[PDB]
Amino acid sequence: GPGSEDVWEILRQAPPSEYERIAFQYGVTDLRGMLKRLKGMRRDEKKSTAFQKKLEPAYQVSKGHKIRLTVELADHDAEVKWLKNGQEIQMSGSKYIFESIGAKRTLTISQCSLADDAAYQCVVGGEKCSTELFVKE
């Protein structure tokens, strides 16, 4: 190396039992530290924080058939934003019905057409899910 410690890449590629030997060889005593922080690094952070149920990857519906999407929030009084491909899904008559059963927001879409065939995003701040409806005609 040019004149560096190098110990980082060296320990990174070193056998696990030899970490302390190699660390102290380069002056490092916190090999344990690099390990412990990495345990927090690989520490699972499952998503769906404000969501209790996110939309499925996709949904298939028959054209002229009613389908409904289901999202659950982690809070009862919190609301979702409804976007289809980037446009706010508004309740058009009895075609788009937001049924909120507690924290569970179920969007029932009556008579899905090819115009309904779009990606739906239920956006909560920090949590959104984009499901893609496939309307089979």
- Name 95's Cβ contacts closer than 8 Å, sequence gap at least 6: 109, 110, 111
Residue type, 48: S
Q: Are residue 51 and residue 82 in the same domain, yes or no?
A: yes
Q: Are residue 116 and residue 71 in the same domain, yes or no?
A: yes
Cα(7)–Cα(122) distance, rounded to whole angstroms?
47
What the block records as the tokens of 33 is 């530290």
* Residue 77 backbone phi and psi in degrees, to 5: -105, 5
Q: Are residue 32 and residue 63 in the same domain, yes or no?
A: no
Alpha-helix runs per DSSP H in the chain: 7-12, 19-26, 31-41
The Cα-based distances of 117 to 6, 63, 69, 76, 114 in angstroms read 55, 9, 13, 29, 5
The Cα-based distances of 120 to 89, 98, 110, 117 in angstroms read 8, 13, 15, 9
- Cβ atoms 103, 73 nearer than 8 A: yes
> What's the number of domains the chain is made of?
2
What the block records as the tokens of 106 is 């179920």
SS3 breakdown of the chain: % helix, strand, coil, rounded to 5? 20, 40, 40
Q: Are residue 67 and residue 116 in the same domain, yes or no?
A: yes
Q: Are residue 94 and residue 135 in the same domain, yes or no?
A: yes
Experimental method, per PDB record: NMR
Q: Are residue 54 and residue 121 in the same domain, yes or no?
A: yes
Structural domain span for residue 17: 1-46
Cα(117)–Cα(115) distance, rounded to whole angstroms?
5
Q: Are residue 18 and residue 42 in the same domain, yes or no?
A: yes
DSSP strand pairing (58-62 vs 127-136): parallel
Q: Are residue 80 and residue 129 in the same domain, yes or no?
A: yes
What the block records as the tokens of 136 is 């089979």
Q: Are residue 42 and residue 52 in the same domain, yes or no?
A: no
